[PDB]
Design a protein around this nucleic acid. Structure first.
Ligand SMILES: [Mg+2]
Lengths: 130, 32, 53, 292, 111, 191, 35
RNA sequence: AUGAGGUGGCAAGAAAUGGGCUACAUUUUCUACCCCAGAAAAUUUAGC
């Protein structure tokens, strides 16, 4: 579009509720795939998006696994891994980032996200019962 | 002091709508 | 899901059915695949079966 | 067969596609490079295929499209080369030049190029006997007092080779907090994996998983295996070793430790001693493992 | 290409996470692919120049097929609508088709 | 009819062409990308009709320009980490309990994964108001769930079908464990 | 079924090997390559 | 009656060869340890 542009855009409604949000110490994202190049491109995408969203992210590569089996005709499965550990992000930032990167999850790539929520002691445990 | 910020709740399709609002119409293509 | 021993009230309280059924409900309480309704119906089936016997 | 117009259109299309890719990836089109092309095409089109050729590639057109359309005469029909009617103008021209050089000289680590490489450079097929004849002429030129120009002309025809002693990696020397120099290394034998640290100065104390070697290795064979590296280079009682081994059995662990400790000791000995240790079979991982 | 180039020169037609370690329902995905290939080859007879590509994103099932330009475009549209709707109601998921017409079969070599 | 890439300008807005994940369209991608092992005195196959380029899970819909534009519009949905929690050291101080929960992204018609019900509660015993006897009793109640090196007690709950139920069960277990460690029975006298 | 389980208390692709091979050999089974 | 029942019986013996399962030790066995202790007592067939 060079002249014909939308005049105004209806931004989605984001209401600041009154409840307190969940806090996450850590958010570890283990993506498993059959191709290393796909996982590398996904790593680039996720890391970049985290950078423009302000989230602190570190990347490492868990060791690959192979499942071999025979019918002699010998078939193979390779699983390669990429681990994206995000740190110090709230509930909403984590939620939106995860929605984005899960909707942009490529083919053959499964995801395992572990979220490490932070909580305070129950009031039943601050003092003993008398 | 740990000031826990407030939850922001958005309707089920907010993220898709924002992403779509980022993208303009394609001039050189027929409709989708 | 964890405390299903309140369905064992109509059974023998100290005989060997108490043993068998307490251990049964211990088994059921560790089942994550069933809902409460199926567990209760299963306990009721044992109720019946022992009552005919 | 590809016409020149086809290649020209491919060149124009490649330029337009390069600018399009630069626009896509956010870089400036003016400074966008071929390494950038490779990185961007790999990212946009991920591929795990092992064959690098099979992976998607965007290249300059001429790099793929080959060409061997050497025309040997013009519109009038006159051949360009005065030796054309021999059918082997390039080969016989080269032979003529060599003969002239030999006449002039008479008046006054590497290998010979293989037959197929001479074919590729001459862009003409030749038999085996004529390649022998050319190599004989080249050797004759070498025997005479060839000058600098003739030496360069010969060097056009002699390829290179390499060795397998410079590929021996000598680990760097590190320093601990106390200021003691040391060197670290790894070794492998069957399922046993060893990680050794050799100190420059010592009293011959070897600690295997924090345990003295004569206690960790009751069997004399393993102690001899640990002795072999230092005894070979005559440095018994001159170094301290701290090594950690895991997996395998007693003998696999001893062999892995021997390999790791020899690879660490390579840092404190002379290059001659490193080569001797290599030739004794000390710096080579043993690939013999259990078979299915 | 022979089978032993499936990860060297050839790729994979069907792509899904089922076979990965820990992931489940690989057999179900295999049966889905078998039925789906049979039905595509039975619904577009003599049109498919090349095998399908069955991609999966969550529920989505993208059938990226390569077809020819012999049959009239209206029949392509009619068949695309029919097959999408029937497969969506058969697999209970949002199936989609991405036909790519070619003037003729794209030969690689001769064997 | 001719492909529409001829109409695409060299300074056009790329994200508009491929807003979302879409297959490879050689009639829409304005690139002379070739893919394939060439035959003897041959070339890698052109894009038109190339099945291999269509089999790639392409990232044309996610370019750096598109990614930056998307993340610029998605900033509105984000909150801010409480600045007081500058690092871990204050993070296990103000918020001792750590609850780990897992979610799985597969591909298929069913979203159910039985492994998502597991919940892991981790709390350092030094943060619990325990005396010497209570700490001893708690540690030798839990057994292997407590690691001496780390001073961390880890309760893994997977009995209940849901995840909220398992989280509640873990909290309940910790509650009863604290109360029964702070209790001295009759047999406790004969240590 | 359930009755049978109760009285007891009181006391990879699901295809034929060849059909697997054809799909596996043609690249129709994802991630299953030949060693 | 190729259906449903009842009354009795039936539960083998001998070789020559083919195959298979067990224990078969002093460079062994039992205890402690995982290796410096104490007590016991002819044809063939494959394989590198
Ligand atoms: Mg009988």
């Amino acid at each position: 579009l060079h002249v014909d542009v939308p005049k105004d855009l209806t931004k989605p409604v984001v209401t600041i509720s009154d409840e307190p949000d969940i806090l996450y110490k850590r958010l570890s994202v283990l993506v498993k795939g059959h191709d290393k190049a796909v996982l590398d491109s996904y790593e680039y995408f996720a890391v970049l998006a985290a950078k423009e969203l302000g989230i602190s992210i570190k990347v490492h590569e868990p060791p690959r696994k192979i499942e071999r089996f025979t019918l002699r005709v010998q078939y193979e499965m390779r699983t390669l891994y990429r681990c994206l550990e995000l740190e110090h992000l709230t509930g909403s930032t984590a939620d939106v980032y995860l929605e984005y990167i899960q909707r942009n999850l490529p083919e053959g790539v499964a995801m395992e996200v572990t979220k490490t929520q932070l909580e305070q002691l129950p009031e039943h445990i601050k003092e003993p019962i008398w | 002091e740990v000031v826990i910020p407030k939850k922001k709740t958005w309707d089920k399709v907010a993220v898709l709508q924002a992403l779509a609002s980022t993208v303009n119409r394609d001039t050189t293509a027929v409709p989708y | 899901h964890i405390f299903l021993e309140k369905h064992l009230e109509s059974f023998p309280k100290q005989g060997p059915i108490r043993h068998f059924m307490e251990l049964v409900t211990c088994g059921l309480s560790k089942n994550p695949y069933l809902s409460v309704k199926q567990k209760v119906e299963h306990i009721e089936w044992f109720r019946n079966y022992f009552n005919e016997k | 067969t590809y016409t020149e117009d086809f290649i020209k259109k491919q060149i124009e299309e490649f330029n337009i596609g390069k600018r399009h890719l630069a626009n896509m990836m956010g870089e400036d089109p003016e400074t966008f490079t071929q390494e950038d092309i490779d990185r961007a095409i790999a990212y946009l089109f991920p591929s795990g295929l092992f064959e690098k050729r099979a992976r998607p590639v965007m290249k300059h057109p001429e790099q793929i499209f080959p060409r061997q359309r050497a025309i040997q005469w013009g519109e009038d029909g006159r051949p360009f080369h005065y030796l054309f009617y021999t059918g082997k103008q390039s080969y016989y021209s080269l032979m003529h030049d060599v003969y002239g050089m030999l006449l002039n000289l008479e008046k006054h680590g590497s290998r010979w190029l293989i037959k197929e490489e001479l074919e590729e450079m001459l862009v003409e097929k030749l038999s085996d006997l004529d390649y022998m004849q050319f190599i004989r002429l080249l050797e004759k030129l070498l025997t005479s007092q060839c000058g600098a120009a003739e030496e360069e002309f010969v060097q056009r025809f002699r390829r290179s080779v390499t060795l397998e002693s410079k590929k021996q990696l000598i680990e760097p020397v590190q320093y601990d907090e106390q200021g003691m120099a040391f060197s670290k290394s790894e070794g492998k034998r069957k399922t046993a994996k060893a990680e050794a640290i050799v100190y420059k100065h010592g009293s011959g104390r070897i600690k295997v998983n924090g345990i003295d070697y004569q206690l960790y290795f009751p069997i004399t064979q393993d102690r001899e295996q640990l002795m072999f590296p230092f005894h070979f280079v005559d440095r018994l009682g001159k170094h301290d070793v701290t090594c950690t081994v895991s997996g395998g059995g007693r003998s696999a662990q001893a062999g892995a430790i021997r390999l790791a400790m020899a690879k660490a000791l390579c840092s404190f000995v002379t290059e001659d001693e490193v080569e001797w240790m290599r030739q004794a079979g000390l710096l080579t991982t043993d690939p013999r493992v259990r078979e299915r | 290409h022979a089978p032993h180039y499936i990860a060297h020169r050839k790729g994979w037609l069907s792509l899904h996470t089922g076979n990965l370690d820990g992931e489940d329902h690989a057999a179900e995905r295999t049966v889905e692919d078998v039925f789906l290939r049979k039905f595509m080859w039975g619904t577009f007879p003599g049109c498919l120049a090349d095998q399908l590509v069955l991609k999966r994103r969550g529920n989505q099932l993208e059938i990226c097929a390569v077809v020819l330009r012999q049959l009239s475009p209206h029949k392509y549209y009619f068949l695309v609508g029919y097959s999408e709707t029937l497969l969506s109601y058969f697999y209970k998921c949002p199936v989609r088709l991405h036909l790519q017409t070619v003037p003729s079969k794209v030969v690689y070599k001769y064997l | 009819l001719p492909p529409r890439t001829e109409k695409m300008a060299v300074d056009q807005d790329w994200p508009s062409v491929y807003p979302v994940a879409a297959p490879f369209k050689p009639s829409a991608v304005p690139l002379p990308v070739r893919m394939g092992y060439p035959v003897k005195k041959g070339v890698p196959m052109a894009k038109e009709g190339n099945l291999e380029l269509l089999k790639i899970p392409n990232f044309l819909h996610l370019t750096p320009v598109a990614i930056k534009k998307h993340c610029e519009a998605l900033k509105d949905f984000c909150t801010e980490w409480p600045a007081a929690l500058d690092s871990d050291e204050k993070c296990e101080k103000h918020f001792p309990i750590e609850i780990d929960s897992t979610d799985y992204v597969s591909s298929g018609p069913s979203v159910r994964n039985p492994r998502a019900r597991v919940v892991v509660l981790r709390v350092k015993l030094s943060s619990l108001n325990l005396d010497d006897h209570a700490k001893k009793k708690l540690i030798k109640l839990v057994g292997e769930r407590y690691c001496k090196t780390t001073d961390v007690l880890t309760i893994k709950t997977d009995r209940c079908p849901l995840r909220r139920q398992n989280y509640d069960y873990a909290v309940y277990l910790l509650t009863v464990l604290y109360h029964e460690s702070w209790n001295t029975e009759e047999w406790e006298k004969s240590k | 079924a359930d009755e049978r389980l109760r009285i007891n208390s009181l006391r990879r692709w699901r295809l034929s090997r060849i059909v697997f091979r054809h799909l596996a050999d043609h690249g129709q089974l994802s991630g299953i390559q030949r060693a």
